[PDB]
């Protein structure tokens, strides 16, 4: 696993744990621990109902923290069934997280800017908001009180005068709490991530169950030109050791090869000599060594399931 993969996994875990409930953490942690995970395998792993799993998967799919992949599987001894797999498309998830973080921060900043503006006015009866400029044109002839148009009743000053500090405190808190995501996004931007696909994710699969009914394989149909929205992404060494006998044999073989080479380039017998007079063509030392060894020893003592298969 690459360090960038670890970084993005940590970012996803933090986002899920901080901005989602507990069951969301369970589901996404399961799908992060494993590769593409079947619906039945996920249900068995987390021991949660289909109805409970529904909202979690739906919310994670809406936030694009989890991608879906439906394919038709044909068991050898059962009716085929369209199985649903869940995985994480890191580029899409990162983009969604970045956009949502930016939007939240921008919303709080805009709320602070709006609150810094004057209060306004409200009508207690019709519950209508009037800006300062809109209320300035509705005052009574006595120049004493602002009167509503529909109700002809005095207006009441709006709230939010004292929240000026509260919104700033909220922003200060949020930035500190959201600090980790920013650093993870910085590292992610420094690095480059490759988009994930069902087949690619299957390469890192850890089987959930011994006999999971889902077939975790990707067998695309042959010559299928159909395109669905958002379904595409951008020797042997041998060593030989020689001995003295092999050395003499090798020189002998080289001599034989040289003889064969000279024979190959040699002129034929008929061309070598003028063949005019020929008929026309048509239809013991061992005991000596032993006594030597004995004598030297005496001297020393004196001094001292059938289918296609390819071979590879």
């Amino acid at each position: 696993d690459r360090p960038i993969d670890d970084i993005v996994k940590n970012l996803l875990k933090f986002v899920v744990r901080g901005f989602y409930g507990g069951s969301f953490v369970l589901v996404l942690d399961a799908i992060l621990f494993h590769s593409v995970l079947a619906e039945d395998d996920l249900k068995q792993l987390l021991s949660i109902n289909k109805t409970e799993l529904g909202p979690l998967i739906a919310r994670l799919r809406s936030d694009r923290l989890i991608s879906i992949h439906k394919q038709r599987e044909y068991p050898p001894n059962s009716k085929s069934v369209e199985r649903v797999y869940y995985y994480v498309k890191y580029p899409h998830a990162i983009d969604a997280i970045k956009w949502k973080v930016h939007q939240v921060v921008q919303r709080l900043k805009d709320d602070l800017d709006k609150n810094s503006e004057p209060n306004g006015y409200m009508c207690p009866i019709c519950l209508t908001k009037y800006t300062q400029l809109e209320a300035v044109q509705l005052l009574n002839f006595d120049r004493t009180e602002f009167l509503c148009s529909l109700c002809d009743e005095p207006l009441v000053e709006d709230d939010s005068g004292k929240k000026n500090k509260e919104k700033q405190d909220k922003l200060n808190r949020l930035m500190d709490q959201i600090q980790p995501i920013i650093d993870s996004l910085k590292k992610i931007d420094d690095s480059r991530i490759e988009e994930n696909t069902f087949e690619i994710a299957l390469a890192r699969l850890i089987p959930p169950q011994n006999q999971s009914h889902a077939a975790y394989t990707y067998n695309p149909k042959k010559g299928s030109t159909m395109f669905r929205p958002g379904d595409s992404a951008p020797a042997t060494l041998h060593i030989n050791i020689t001995t003295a006998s092999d050395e003499v044999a090798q020189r002998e073989l080289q001599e034989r090869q040289a003889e064969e080479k000279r024979k190959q380039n040699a002129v034929p017998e008929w061309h070598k000599q003028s063949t005019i007079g020929k008929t026309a063509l048509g239809r013991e030392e061992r005991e000596n060594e032993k006594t030597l060894n004995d004598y030297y020893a005496a001297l020393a003592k004196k001094q001292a399931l059938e289918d296609e298969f390819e071979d590879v």
């Binding site: 899409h92 931007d189 958002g230 595409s232």
Partner: peptide
């Protein structure tokens, strides 16, 4: 918004 996007429009993915 000046933020680097880590994705591309699928319409641009030339088969």
């Amino acid at each position: 918004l000046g933020l680097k996007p880590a994705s591309v429009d699928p319409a641009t993915i030339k088969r």
